[PDB]
């Protein structure tokens, strides 16, 4: 099956941030993702460490415990922006942040991700992840919440 | 970076499970780890995917969202077992599960880890992680909770 790129990856705070979409998926636990039959796509945020990542991740590692909010808007057209929170999950090609999304038909869409670090008050995983701070094994502070945007042309499941 | 081994790694459920320890650490958020000055070691569970991991992890990837309990027993042995829950955290060499621990002096110890998958009701990370189940991108079910044990000799510091 086809995985569609959403623009080109952007590099910030020692991380590569990429956006992709595919057909809606099914996930355990059930009842968290919007039903696949009631969705158009499964949108994903692919976040991996660059070389010399300041938070201690080896190059290519998945960056875990982040919280991602998205806003998808049909470019210059009728309809409200489509918003939601991604969920961390694993697939046959590894761990991703993603969500099943219902769109507003074929056309151009803006896609914006707002990426929250593990220590952000909005991130629900903040009580469950730490960062070493001692001189010997410590790392630099977490990045501050930031956004990245792209656009893509949605045509459906016409493959 | 210098760490000390606790026995040798064990391969189970498509994962390499290793136990290591180093000097006590400091962590953000503060006040969660036992104070470094009140600890002897920082104990770690190093868990990485093997080749053909059944849950979709590429070989060498850190296995995230696990919940790990530990029990450390001094072989003879007048003290109570040392117990705790590890916390996931990142250090200059990458992410680990770890905890600051106060031991019961030099000697031989048994170390047992109980590893909970990310869908276990006992695991507080379970509400935050999922697994694709569709034919095209899906993975095999999570492993069942299991334990691993090692012996090691502690001499300080
Ligand atoms: Na496009
Ligand atoms: Na703090
Ligand atoms: Ni996904």
Question: How does this model look, in words?
Answer:
- It is classed as transport protein.
- The entry lists the keywords copper binding, iron transport, transport protein.
- The assembly is dimeric.
- FtrA/P19 of Rubrivivax gelatinosus in complex with Ni.
- The structure is a homodimer.
- Chain A is mostly beta strands.
- Chain A has one domain (1-159).
- In chain A, 0% of the residues lie in helices and 48% in strands.
- The first copy, chain A, has no helices and eleven strands.
- Chain A has a five-stranded antiparallel beta sheet, with no helix packed on it.
- In chain A, strand 5 and strand 6 form a beta hairpin.
- Strand 10 of chain A pairs parallel with strand 7 (87-91) of chain B, so a sheet runs across the interface.
- The structure holds sodium ion (2 copies) and nickel (II) ion.
Which key features would you list for this structure?
homodimer; 159 residues; mainly beta; five-stranded antiparallel sheet; four-stranded antiparallel sheet; 48% strand; binds sodium ion; binds nickel (II) ion; transport protein; copper binding; iron transport; dimeric; FtrA-P19 protein
